[PDB]
Amino acid sequence: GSSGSSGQGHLVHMTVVSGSNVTLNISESLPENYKQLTWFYTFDQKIVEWDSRKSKYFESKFKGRVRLDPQSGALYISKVQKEDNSTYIMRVLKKTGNEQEWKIKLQVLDPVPKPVIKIEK
């Protein structure tokens, strides 16, 4: 996965191997001081919310193995699964009084190698 977008908010495309510890970190590090920090698994799906108090997991399977760092705001997933591959959206409420949302298309790959297929016209 490499760069491939432009505008006032390029899309993030990360790629890792299945069953490996990943780390979701928004390009731009959290501002001076954020107010709200939540993670979205899908278009209308959440994973964990942080009300400037204590992380809150919304009955998300991830809960248990994953972990949300309120210091940086990164999501660490263990023994990830091919399914994990999805558009991640981290919504945060800026102190000033704004609302931003990033995007990360997680791309999981398989470890097992591949054979040597050759074609002879």
Task: Report how far residue 27's alpha carbon sits from residue 21's, in angstroms, rounded to the nearest whole number.
Answer: 19
Residue 120: CATH number of its domain: 2.60.40.10
Residue 83: Cβ within 10 Å count: 10
For the purposes of burial, counting CB atoms within 10 Å of the CB of 80, is it exposed (0-12), middle (13-18) or buried (19 or more)? buried
Q: Given phi > 0 = left and psi -120 to 50 = alpha, else beta, which region is 9?
A: left
Domains identified in the chain, total number: 1
Experimental technique for the deposited model: NMR
Give per-residue burial for 16-55: e unless 16+ CB within 10 Å, then b: bebeeebebbbeeebeeebbebbbbbeeeebbbbbeeeeb
Cα–Cα nearest to 73, from 103, 34, 45, 108: 34
Residue 5: Cβ within 10 Å count: 10
Q: Given phi > 0 = left and psi -120 to 50 = alpha, else beta, which region is 47?
A: alpha
Q: Sheet containing 22-24: give its strands across.
A: 22-24, 75-77, 67-68
Contact 84, 106 (CB under 8 A): yes
Helix count and strand count (H, E) for the chain: 0, 11
Task: Report how far residue 106's alpha carbon sits from residue 11's, in angstroms, rounded to the nearest whole number.
Answer: 11
Helices assigned H by DSSP within the chain: none
Q: Write out the residue range of the structural domain in which residue 49 sits.
A: 1-121
